[PDB]
Paper text:
Two of these, exotoxins-S and -T (ExoS; ExoT), are homologous enzymes consisting of an N-terminal GTPase-activating protein (GAP) domain (73% identity; 81% similarity) and a C-terminal ADP-ribosyltransferase (ART) domain (78% identity; 87% similarity). The ADP-ribosyltransferase activity of ExoS and ExoT and their cellular toxicity are dependent upon association of the ART domains with 14-3-3 proteins. Here we present crystal structures of human 14-3-3β in complex with the ART domain of both ExoS and ExoT. Collectively, our results indicate that 14-3-3 proteins act as exotoxin chaperones rather than activators.
Residue numbers in the entry:
A (entry chain C): 232 to 432, 445 to 453
B (entry chain A): 3 to 233
C (entry chain B): 3 to 232
The structure:
Amino acid sequence: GADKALADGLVKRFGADAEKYLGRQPGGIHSDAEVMALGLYTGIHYADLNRALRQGQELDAGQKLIDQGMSAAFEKSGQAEQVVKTFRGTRGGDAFNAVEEGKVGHDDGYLSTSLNPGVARSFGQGTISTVFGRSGIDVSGISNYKNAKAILYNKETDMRVLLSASDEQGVTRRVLEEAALGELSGHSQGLLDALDLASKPLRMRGLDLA
Amino acid sequence: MDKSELVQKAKLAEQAERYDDMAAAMKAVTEQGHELSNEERNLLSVAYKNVVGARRSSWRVISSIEQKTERNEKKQQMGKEYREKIEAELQDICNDVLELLDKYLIPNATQPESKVFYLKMKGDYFRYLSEVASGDNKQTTVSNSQQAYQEAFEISKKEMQPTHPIRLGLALNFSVFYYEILNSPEKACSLAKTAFDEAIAELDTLNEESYKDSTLIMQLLRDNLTLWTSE
Amino acid sequence: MDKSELVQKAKLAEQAERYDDMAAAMKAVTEQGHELSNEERNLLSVAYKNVVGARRSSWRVISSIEQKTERNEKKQQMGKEYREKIEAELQDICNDVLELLDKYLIPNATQPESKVFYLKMKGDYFRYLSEVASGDNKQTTVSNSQQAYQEAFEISKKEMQPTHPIRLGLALNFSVFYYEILNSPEKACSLAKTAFDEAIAELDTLNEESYKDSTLIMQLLRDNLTLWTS
Ligand SMILES: O=C(O)CCc1nc2sc3c(c2c(=O)[nH]1)CCC3
């Protein structure tokens, strides 16, 4: 009904360009309006849409549907079962450049990331990030140019910088974790303690005051 | 006593922070001649890390006091004796744990991950012996520390990922062996650089099980490198 | 072994945080049958505070796990055994301590400050015994804790200032004995109130620089009081 309204909207304003993604997930966690928006995005609109979201300008009538259609999909989905190692590369700087190591931050636009470490390189050798999350959508079913096998993370989805380091090549190599996975996540039970790493980790006198 | 009973007492003694009983329980489990499970290996390693570490602190403390307090032929003899009492314990803790490595842990270990872990651990307890060791005996314990680390290092390069917490952990302790024991910052840095450079290059090789584990050890390397190379 | 040699090893063992050796050194100094100097008394008291305290924590730690994991009859039996092994250690440390108090420390102590300090300590180590003690034996260790505290308390009232860190210290532990061991908050707050209100009434005599020692212990008393009236 609301999904029918958004599905009717996306087609009325994008035609066959939107209509070509109908029934790409015969599994069907997501609606027709949700599958279409994600595909429209993954295909070509990821350019202009994230351009408008990052720059904080007013979205256009078409952009607005792709956005509300993608947001709809991230709700339905939520935090999955296993942690997903995905890679995302940029030409120059990323919104995580000002986020200091240990602290958290977010990219104002949607975070398109790949399963292929090679196709993430294809997008730039400015910053090469490895992302571990659980609230990502596998749009590889809907669009998959250069066999990207993309996993998209929501807009303004908060990430913790676990490691930010530079190459002798100059390329800054980051490791981001989806904030909501916690502090406990990412460690093998007591391995760090057993490794016994070579690094450093109100009363006065005798009266036993209890 | 049963393998499971000893491991339950070993898990119990840890919470109680009775690391001496925790060590005795795991020593018994090891002496059963069977290859330890990842949990068992971790319980043994933390027990002895804590037992040996307790005397390493006490030793450094008394050695610090040995130097600060220097006037009386008797008061200084009191210090030498107490330093020597603690050296005696450190030597015996390292001997139990190095004998466990030689007799059971290293021979029984079949997977490479474990064979590296224990060989790194052999260098660790030889390094602790080296810290207190003197002259000809120091020469022997330093030679043995370097050999155990080097043997594990060649295996870690062949059969392991540059981002493995075990490979990275060995790389941090060996670089600390060169900087502290052999007093070669050049050797120390060279090792830490390579281990880091190889890891930053292949962050796609991170495990989803131990990613936070690796980044932590990678930070410690990157920090020592920038600290050792700073004026 | 020389008295001075043992005290040097006792001072040394403290920095090394080898409180078991620190306790053995001071036990030997006490067994010499001479009245301990303020420093010696303080070295003995911190050594055993730490030795006994270590097992008090370990005991509470295993006891919490004992009740939280009544899933398996063998895993539970592992718990009971380890709790009992620690109870053994606790009992033996408190036996070492109380035997030192009865045989040497309390008979030999001559000034009132001394005779209160050790009688308060006698009450403390009986209280620690009471925490783990069962039935008829618990009845005995609770009776003995109350008696040692009460004996010291009468002496502290007669021969000591209401602001003395030792008198305040005993008042602190005895009110905690009533609240924790006898489970009488009424008895606990009544004692803590009196000890505090007598100390606020006569603090006008600031003991030159010792009006930091007393203010600290006075806080702990006032802070427990306001917490109990919840
Ligand atoms: O505008 C953007 O989204 C940032 C640049 C960028 N885009 C993309 S899309 C895509 C990837 C990627 C990327 O790495 N950077 C890899 C999975 C598919």
